[PDB]
Amino acid sequence: SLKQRLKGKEGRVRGNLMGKRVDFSARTVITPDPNLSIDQVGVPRSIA
Amino acid sequence: MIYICGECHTENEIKSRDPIRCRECGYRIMYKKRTKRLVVFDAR
């Protein structure tokens, strides 16, 4: 029903207006690299 | 094409839209035969 569809956790307000899935984001494992600055990160070439 | 029985390993051409059974063995598990176009590997 339209109450159960606008209800709480994963509804239309707690699940599609506050928290939403965002495009343009990639996640990869981290490894050390002491030859980098603090200001930098090293991206692989397939993600880039 | 050509199929291989799962018990007696006797090749037998199964025609399209035809029951799946061997001959001389009466079995119902068939393995497709390896291809004939060639692929090359590296020892690396």
Binding site: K20, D23, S25, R27, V29, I47 | -
Partner: protein, 49 residues
């Protein structure tokens, strides 16, 4: 001995054989990226492709 310059290392290194295992979590399975991908139909929110 150092491998780049051949000089000795001032400290002595503790070395020996041990038994290691290779876990199941490999990196080929955890990398993924999205940039203007397919979207849903009813709510027009980004969807898996």
């Amino acid at each position: 001995y150092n491998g780049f310059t051949g000089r000795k290392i001032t400290s002595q290194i503790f070395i020996g054989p041990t038994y290691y295992q290779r876990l199941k979590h490999m990196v080929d399975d955890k990398i993924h990226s999205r940039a203007r991908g397919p979207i849903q139909i009813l709510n027009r929110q980004p969807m898996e492709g």
